């Protein structure tokens, strides 16, 4: 209760995912579907193609006519239903995607033909030599070849990207049920903090955590609310938390959670807000004082992350705990982060705690594993790259105390790549 | 000119990057910086910390006093400049981040002390035993330890993520010069096309390419304009292109670029728009009829991608050619896509052309390389995942005609992971 027990990193992570709710559903326009999870199955109400369609530029023929010289009776062009029937000894010009006319049963691509006659002005083809024996149905997509009416084309639980949006467009299902996205409120606490826009005053520094955290959350596509800087005292913290609860599904605070003139926050969460603190310390480096609470009001579960004030600790813990919770809330069935294998670019000393650090992942020519280079430790160009990984290093053992350059380690992906 | 020469995939890609311009600059608020590239160096105008700051909860001491019993004359708390001077035999309580008072030269963490006396109500500490010999300056961050006034903290060319936004906040540089993002207009052409919202009519299908392409571009954070469906005829195409040129930096069309009742588009680009077509066919699968043009109007270079109408071809070529061009336009110095190594989940037949296909990348327990599974080829859960990779398979040779399950191949990353 104070000091809260040290919670293992594995227990803390499982606890967050177990206790975090899945948000309810809403209907959206399909164009707004990026990153959403479907909460319904989606069915085709038409065939694709809905008419027999040519695969090629060429001619719709009767296969039974075989090769030979044919009169061209017209053309079938994309977008128009032909009105003519192809009779023996005749063909119709077709383009890719055009409907196959009545009377024809195959398409012969233009490369397997030679033109015999055209109009005097050259605009219309009149007679063509078909050089091959068409196979029945060749170069035609029959009705429903790609999608059948009544086919389920997307399952509930699908996490949508551009191709899924395109598939919704294809089948004309322009309104879909999806899980809501979490609204995430972020505040900072500490009497030393000024806004980024402020000149410094004695004893003060600028608040960076709000900005870093909001940007991290925005990067993942979730709506955010900036609740500003809150004074480190019980009344102001309670008011800010109540605003967060009212306005958002998730409240993130940073600061006020180490031991000292600080645990107003853990105290306010418990005694004033009546929230359930599930852990208040985690055996990790950085991130020791990380706190996770839930609050149930009238059948709704709010989640509260009280992150360390240290700016590095705040951003590491946001990636380890907050992002997976948000993924679960927005309906992603397996909300775990992507963890990949990479080679260390430098030796690193291990701690009794599992340790985490921002890094850059780079592939080197034809080498199969990427290299991971911890940020902050210098070339010019590499010192400029934005972090796309979080090194996840194991606790030291009486055996292994140090990992060396080249050795394969776990890296959580936190940026593109 | 028609048929345009087959351009190699390598030549086509280099051509796009060589001919694509870098957009000009603008000043933005730092909160809007995600994914932007800085067009200025950024300097600190203050020190961090700007005062000597305690690293620990404990006491500010005189090291020369050594261990022993000390009167506590007050407390230094985060955010307030202390007014008292610590004299021999005295200490001041400090919290993490608090300023070190005059007269003290070290901090002793609370764990290396024992309290002797406190006020009758327990609220104020009065006397403490210092159990250790402090080293001079111990557990103090001196002025400028982390950032010095006048230090360049971010270089021009930096592609910003959340930590860079936080660093801007730290140093109070809330307005920054960055490259503009490209505005990308997308249209579809073809007489067979209906809008997603439409019921089918004879001879028609719904347009999916606009949706897929717009979503792909939006995923990368660039503003878009939907120019709708354009009839496959010279006048309407010219008008739509002119609108695109007026409204956007990049125009993407799909359809009207194969050979037949189609190359109104390549013809309109050349004769009516007076654009320079750099290639009109690419030796690739899919994507043969992919066309890239530039148009210089009054010192401004517009870029035009005329992508194939086939919906699969359109999305593959968007990822190979369009996204890297957009990355260059928004100022990214090395706009190449991230290509990783992965193991094939299935045998695949090679083509005389290099071939590309959407896939899913998955890591398997402790195996170092991810597995790549081509989409569309079926488990239930895997058939549901959204594509995060594009398989990049080599042309066949008289030697190698087939690649087998397990073999290591190139995959372009196109989704998170």
From Swiss-Prot, chains A, B:
Tissue expression from the record: Expressed in tissues including spinal cord, brain, liver, kidney and lung.
UniProt activity-regulation remark: Inhibited by copper and tungsten.
Known catalytic reactions: molybdopterin + ATP + H(+) = adenylyl-molybdopterin + diphosphate; adenylyl-molybdopterin + molybdate = Mo-molybdopterin + AMP + H(+)
Effect recorded for residue 13 to A: Reduced GLRB binding
Cell location: Postsynaptic cell membrane; Cell membrane; Cytoplasm, Cytosol; Cytoplasm, Cytoskeleton
EC numbers for this chain: 2.7.7.75, 2.10.1.1
Modification after translation (UniProt): Phosphorylated.
Disulfide links within the chain: none
Gene Ontology terms for molecular function: ATP binding; identical protein binding; metal ion binding; molecular adaptor activity; molybdopterin adenylyltransferase activity; molybdopterin cofactor binding; molybdopterin molybdotransferase activity; nitrate reductase activity
Cofactor field: Mg(2+)
Main location: membrane
Chain's role: Microtubule-associated protein involved in membrane protein-cytoskeleton interactions. It is thought to anchor the inhibitory glycine receptor (GLYR) to subsynaptic microtubules. Acts as a major instructive molecule at inhibitory synapses, where it also clusters GABA type A receptors. Also has a catalytic activity and catalyzes two steps in the biosynthesis of the molybdenum cofactor. In the first step, molybdopterin is adenylated. Subsequently, molybdate is inserted into adenylated molybdopterin and AMP is released.
Family membership noted in the UniProt record: In the N-terminal section; belongs to the MoaB/Mog family. In the C-terminal section; belongs to the MoeA family.
Record protein name field: Gephyrin
């Amino acid at each position: 209760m104070s000091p809260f027990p040290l919670t293992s990193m594995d227990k803390a992570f499982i606890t967050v995912l177990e206790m975090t709710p899945v948000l309810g559903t809403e209907i959206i326009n399909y164009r707004d579907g990026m990153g959403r999870v479907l909460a319904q199955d989606v069915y085709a109400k038409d065939n694709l193609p809905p008419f027999p369609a040519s695969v090629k530029d060429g001619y719709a023929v009767r296969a039974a006519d075989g090769p030979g010289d044919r009169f061209i009776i017209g053309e079938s062009q994309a977008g128009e239903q032909p009105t003519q029937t192809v009779m023996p000894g005749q063909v119709m010009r077709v383009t890719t995607g055009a409907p196959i006319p009545c009377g024809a049963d195959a398409v012969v691509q233009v490369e397997d033909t030679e033109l015999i006659r055209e109009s005097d002005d050259g605009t219309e083809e009149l007679e063509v030599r078909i050089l091959v024996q068409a196979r029945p149905g060749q170069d035609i997509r029959p009705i429903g070849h790609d999608i059948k009416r009544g086919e389920c084309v997307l399952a509930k639980g699908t996490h949508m990207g551009p191709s899924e949006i395109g598939l919704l467009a294809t089948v004309g299902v322009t309104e879909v049920e999806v899980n809501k996205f979490p609204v995430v409120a972020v505040m900072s606490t500490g009497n030393e903090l000024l806004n980024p826009e402020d000149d410094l005053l004695p004893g003060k520094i600028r608040d960076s955590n709000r900005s870093t955290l909001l940007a991290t959350i925005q990067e993942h596509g979730y709506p955010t609310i900036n609740l500003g800087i809150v004074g480190d005292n019980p009344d102001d913290l309670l008011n800010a938390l109540n605003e967060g609860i009212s306005r958002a599904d998730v409240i993130i605070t940073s600061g006020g959670v180490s031991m000292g003139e600080k645990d107003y926050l853990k105290q306010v969460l418990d005694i004033d807000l009546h929230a359930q603190i599930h852990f208040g310390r985690v055996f990790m480096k950085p991130g020791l004082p990380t706190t996770f609470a839930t609050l149930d009001i009238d059948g709704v579960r709010k989640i509260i992350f009280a992150l360390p004030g240290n700016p590095v600790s705040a951003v590491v813990t946001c990636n380890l705990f907050v992002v997976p919770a948000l993924r679960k809330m927005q309906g992603i069935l397996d909300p775990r982060p992507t963890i990949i294998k990479a080679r260390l670019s430098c030796d690193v000393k291990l701690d009794p705690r599992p340790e985490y650090h921002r890094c850059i992942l780079t592939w080197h020519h034809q080498e199969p594993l990427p290299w991971a280079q911890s940020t902050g430790n210098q070339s010019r160009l590499m010192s400029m790259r934005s972090a796309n990984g979080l090194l996840m290093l194991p606790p030291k053992t009486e055996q292994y105390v140090e990992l060396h350059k080249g050795e394969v380690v776990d890296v959580m992906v936190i940026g593109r790549l």
